[PDB]
């Protein structure tokens, strides 16, 4: 009996298949989150600066109140 190297292909490994595809981001939907984070960013920040004004006037009031200084 002769024994040589046997042939096997099975699945053929798929000859040239695309793996690159669009994922997560679509296009217009990313701008809704992108610019949406900006509008949420300013509104949250400016409310803190209005709360800073409560401290600001109260800080300068200490100088006016102190005349024996």
């Amino acid at each position: 009996x002769x024994x040589x190297x046997x042939x096997x292909x099975x699945x053929x490994x798929x000859x040239x298949x695309x793996x690159x595809x669009x994922x997560x981001x679509x296009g217009y939907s990313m701008f809704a989150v992108g610019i949406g984070a900006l509008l949420f960013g300013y509104w949250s920040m400016m409310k803190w600066n209005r709360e800073r004004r409560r401290l600001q006037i109260e800080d300068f009031e200490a100088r006016i109140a102190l005349m024996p200084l």
């Binding site: 490994x13 798929x14 040239x16 298949x17 695309x18 793996x19 690159x20």
Partner: peptide, 16 residues
């Protein structure tokens, strides 16, 4: 396993 390995370069170099 090779077909995925070569396609890893395209999502790394060509698309950039």
């Amino acid at each position: 396993n090779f077909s995925l390995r070569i396609d890893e370069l395209e999502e790394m170099l060509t698309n950039n």
